[PDB]
Amino acid sequence: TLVHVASVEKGRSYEDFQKVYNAIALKLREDDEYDNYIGYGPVLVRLAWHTSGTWDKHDNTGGSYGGTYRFKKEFNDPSNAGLQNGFKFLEPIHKEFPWISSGDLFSLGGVTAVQEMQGPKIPWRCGRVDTPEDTTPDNGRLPDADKDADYVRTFFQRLNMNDREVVALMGAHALGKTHLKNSGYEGPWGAANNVFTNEFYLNLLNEDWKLEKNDANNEQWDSKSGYMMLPTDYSLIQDPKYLSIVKEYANDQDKFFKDFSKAFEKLLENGITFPKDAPSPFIFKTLEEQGL
Ligand code: HEM
């Protein structure tokens, strides 16, 4: 096989997408009360990841291209509980810029959130095209959180990610929090949960973790500081190959930034064929860099 060729929204170029980025960024700044003043940054990053994370490299089903989260089957995946907040955030952006495809909007939301939260630049390509309801992938392609390193490693092979790519991507769990009503887990992973840093890896290594049960009767790792880790997070320190990489990112902020950028762009582009004469990837300026 199934091929998805990137097709640029007619006549559009860099400055068009910078305007969309800016609208997303200005709204992130303005709607700062959401989720007890965490803001919408983290949930927009998660929306970008879940809308891309359904891809299967074996038959090119799912993926970011089609923007299929807009259809009820995907919108209602239990794995996607909570993401409706990110979709509602993006509705007035799409209303203002109706020419942008849904896949481009969901993925750009994630890029914008990362950069506006002071994370690395994430180069971004346009040209995802909406596909019909019957191309929506079935529920069950996003990962379980109660499993071990072997499960994590095997799961991400389906997304064509290796050990380094997996450990880098998981650093996005510095952001936001788990919410009991959404996923059956509760609590933030760190203190700095709307600013993008390598705090996830520092916390895995330096906090004193206790294996406890939360109020939904699921096990999670808790610290005295009020932080939590999922079993799938904690697995990155139980598997000695993951552990080496975790230590690497805990000791090099720049390296984590560069590896995360690459891995997250790749996650967002999986499944898409870019014609040889497609535009180069766009690197958007932050509001702060524009003096806006
Ligand atoms: C084994 C892989 C993963 C598992 C099991 C997993 C699981 C979870 C769970 C259970 C939550 C809490 C959802 C809620 O209760 O609201 C969550 C939140 C989140 N995840 Fe993942 N995740 C994984 C990988 C990733 C990746 C690759 C990214 C992005 C690169 C990511 C980004 C986030 C973000 C930003 C949140 C916070 C959302 C918010 O605060 O609303 N996760 N994850």
Contacts of 206 (CB under 8 A, 6+ apart): none
Same domain, 122 and 5: yes
137 and 147 belong to one structural domain: no
Catalytically active residues, by annotation: 50, 189
Experimental determination technique:
X-ray
- Least Cα distance to 147 among 212, 230, 228, 242 occurs for 230
User: Closest ligand 1 atom, CA of 171?
Assistant: 30
CA of 228 to the centre of ligand 1 (A): 12
| CB distance 169 to ligand 1 below 6 Å | yes
- CA-nearest residue for atom 36, ligand 1, is 46
Whether 168 and 110 map to the same domain: the answer is no
Of residues 111, 135, 38, 44, the one with CA closest to residue 83: 44
The annotation status of 173 as a binding-site residue, yes or no, is yes
User: Position of tokens 């806006």?
Assistant: 292
* C-alpha–C-alpha distance, residues 124 and 282, integer Å: 5
Residues 33 and 46 in one domain: yes
Identify the domain containing residue 53 by its residue range.
Answer: 1-142+264-292
Nearest 5°: phi and psi at 273? -100, 125
* Resolution number, Å: 2.2
**Region class of 2: left (phi > 0), else alpha (psi between -120 and 50), else beta:** beta
The backbone torsions φ and ψ at residue 219, rounded to the nearest 5 degrees and listed phi first, read -80, 140
Residue closest via CA to ligand 1's atom 14 equals 178
The whole-angstrom separation of Cα 112 and Cα 98 is 18
- How many domains are contained in the chain? 2
Which residues are within 8 A (CB) of 220 and not within 5 positions of it... i.e. 6 or more apart?
178, 185, 186, 187, 211, 212, 213, 214, 228, 229, 230, 231
Distance CA 234, CA 227 (A): 12
- Provide the CATH number for the domain around residue 157: 1.10.420.10
50: Cβ below 6 Å to ligand 1? Answer: no
Q: What are phi and psi of 272, to 5 degrees?
A: -100, 130
Q: Which two tokens stand for residue 90?
A: 């993006």
| Rounded Cα distance, 78 and 74, in Å | 9
Strand order in the sheet with 210-213: 210-213, 219-222, 228-229
Angle between helices 41-52 and 14-30 (to 10 degrees): 130
Strands 4-5 and 272-273: parallel
Q: Does the C-beta of 175 come closer than 6 Å to ligand 1?
A: yes
- Residue 44's domain is classified under what CATH number? 1.10.520.10
The residue behind tokens 């914008």 is 112
* b/e 261-273 (16+ beta carbons within 10 angstroms → b): bebbbebbbbbbe
Domain shared by 157 and 213, yes or no: yes
At position 164, the amino acid (one-letter code) is R
Query: What distance in angstroms lies between residue 173's CA and the mean position of ligand 1's atoms?
Result: 6
CB 35 within 8 A of CB 243: no
Residue 56: CB partners within 8 Å, gap ≥ 6? 62, 137, 141, 158
Q: Is 232 in the pocket of ligand 1 (CB under 6 A)?
A: yes
